[model samples]
Target: MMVFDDIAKRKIRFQTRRGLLELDLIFGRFMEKEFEHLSDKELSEFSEILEFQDQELLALINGHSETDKGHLIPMLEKIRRA
Candidate 1:
């Protein structure tokens, strides 16, 4: 796993912030386990998912909604597996 630079860590920290406890746990754990390993492209994809609304993320993570976004499903699955 690549070591994340300070800027990347800060960006990931900001993106992972959530108002909901469930979201906080899921994203927070994901950051702990995977953030340092992501490549530049994967980081961009993860960042895009973080840009989504809280409800959308909740729905997707909770299996209440589906998505066709190319990078989204895989990242969601990874989070779920984590």
Candidate 2:
């Protein structure tokens, strides 16, 4: 069985018929830094996302775009629990 801390420390490795790749992520830190810069549009859209599922916020932090590093949500305000 894989331990959580072990998974946290090392890049996860996977293999396909074509090849293998490793992915390591520090989502909390990424989220903090990425949230620093957000367009107004993004901030508004982010609120909508939050309205649906607050847990999605975690996925957003870990999620990335092909050309972007992280999400663009401004500091939350009057946030309601999801």
Candidate 3:
């Protein structure tokens, strides 16, 4: 039930910037296309996803890595679609 205003949205945008341009570009698409539809649960999972290393996140998206972190799979799918 969390709604983002200008500052919150901007902060999240800034936070999504990865050192890897590939990661950054996908996130840019994901945020534009899907972020507004996320429930609070996925939004938190999104935050958790951000805590991952750039390469780790790339691995997940590319299916080179695995997760026992269940929420991550769905979140990864969202990014993949983006």
Candidate 4:
């Protein structure tokens, strides 16, 4: 019962545009292809990750650092896999 309304989807897409184009493309693709399929918990984690600073997000995306944010690891993995 995850409610991925138009506003949420648009917000996710907007947040995907990071300071780095590489990050932007990766996150944008994930948002476009998989955002709607996430469980409520996963979507919540995704939103939290979107709030992370650009450097932190880059570290996570590059597999250089693990997130301390509870459910975000799996969401990050899903983004990477996408």
Which one is best on TM-score? 1
Q: C-alpha displacement of 46 in model 1, angstroms?
A: 0.4
Pairwise lDDT winner, candidates 1 and 2: 1
lDDT tens string, model 1, 1-82? 4334557657776877667787788766776776656676677667767777667778877887667687777887775566
RMSD of each: 3.9, 14.3, 3.0, 2.8
Q: Scored by CA lDDT, what does every candidate get? A: 0.70, 0.30, 0.70, 0.70
- lDDT of each residue in 1-82, candidate 3, tens digit only: 5444555556566667767898888777777777777655556666667767678778877787767777777787775677
Per-candidate TM-score against the hidden true structure: 0.72, 0.28, 0.70, 0.70
Error of 2 at 20 (Å): 31
Cα deviation of 63 in candidate 2 (Å)?
Answer: 12
Error of 4 at 25 (Å): 1.4
